C-alpha cells in the first residue's frame, strides 16, 4: 500500500489486468484514484487504446472532465493518478433515485455537453459515451471518466460508415437516459432496426422543451445533426440560467508561478526551474503532480 508518493486504500474497481484503488498523495494528504494497468497482459490493439488515452487526459482541463495528475511508468506496469469522484456512478444513481427531473438533468446535462465540446474544440471525439462512463464527484457534478455500448451507437455506425456528429448522437441518447431512467432504443437487429428507425418512446412526463433538444441531438442524417455549438444555445439547456447562457468551454489561462504552491514546493527539496519546466513540458510527474494537487 505505497506505490511512488502515494499510500494505497480501498480497491473501489477491478477487472482484467487493469485495477482502480483510492489512494492519498503523501505529500499533500490529497485523494486520488490509481488506475493500475499490468501491460504485460495488454493485447495489440488495446494498448494503441491506452496511449491514446493517456495522450488525450494530458491536455484536457475542463471541471467535468476527470483530471490527471501524476503518470508513474515501469517496463510491466502503468500508474495513472486522476481525481477520485466520490459521489460514484451516475448509472447507480439513476437506479437508486428512479431517474432525474429536468431542472436536475439539465444542472448535470449542462456541464456533460460542456465538457464533450471541449473535447471537439481541440478536435478529440469520445466516439463511445456511456451512462457507465459518467460519474459524480462530492457536489454531485458530472466528471466524465475515460477513453480506455451499443444503444449509445450512431445510425451510420451500423450503415458502416466516426467524427464529432457521432458524440452528438450518444448525448442525445444520455439525456434521454438521464430524464427517462430507461435507454431509447432496444438481441442485435432489433436493436439495428428502432436506432436506424429513430423512432424512440416519448414519455408521458416528459415536457415539449425537452422534446425538441431530443431532436436537436437524435436526427437519422449524420450529415444534418447540429453542432453541440449550436446545439448549446437551446431553450431547454438555458431554464433557469437565461443571462448564463451555454457557451463554449471558457479554459482558464495557465497559473504555472502560484507563490503559494511554489514556496511549500521549493520547502519540499524541488528546485523553482523544475517546478516551471514540469509544467511547461506538461511532463505529469512527481513535480506536476505536486503543483497540480496542492492547489485544492
Ligand atoms: C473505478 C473507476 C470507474 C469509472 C467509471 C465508472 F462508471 C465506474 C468506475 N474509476 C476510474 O477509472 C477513475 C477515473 C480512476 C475513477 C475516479 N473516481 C471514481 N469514483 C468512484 C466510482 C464508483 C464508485 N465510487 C467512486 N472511479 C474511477
Known sequence: ????????????????????????????????????????????????????EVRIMKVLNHPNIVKLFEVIETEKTLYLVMEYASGGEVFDYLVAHGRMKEKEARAKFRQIVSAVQYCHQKFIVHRDLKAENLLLDADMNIKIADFGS????????FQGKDGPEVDVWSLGVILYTLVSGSLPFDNLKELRERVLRGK???????????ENLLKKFLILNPSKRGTLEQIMKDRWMNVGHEDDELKP??????????????????????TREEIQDSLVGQRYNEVMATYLLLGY
Not at 4 to 28: C, E, P, Q, S
Not at 150 to 157: C, H, I, M, Q
Not at 203 to 209: G, I
Open 200 to 210: 424512440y418512446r416519448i414519455p408521458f412526463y416528459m415536457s415539449t422543451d425537452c
Open 150 to 157: 451499443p444503444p449509445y451507437a450512431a445510425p451510420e455506425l
Open 1 to 52: 500500500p505505497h506505490i511512488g508518493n502515494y499510500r494505497l486504500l480501498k480497491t473501489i474497481g477491478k477487472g482484467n489486468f487493469a485495477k482502480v484503488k483510492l489512494a492519498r498523495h503523501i505529500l499533500t494528504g490529497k485523494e486520488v484514484a490509481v488506475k493500475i494497468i499490468d501491460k504485460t497482459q495488454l493485447n495489440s490493439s488495446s494498448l494503441q487504446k491506452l496511449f491514446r
Open 249 to 270: 468551454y471558457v479554459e482558464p489561462l495557465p497559473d504555472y508561478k502560484d507563490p503559494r504552491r511554489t514556496e511549500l514546493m521549493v520547502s519540499m527539496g524541488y
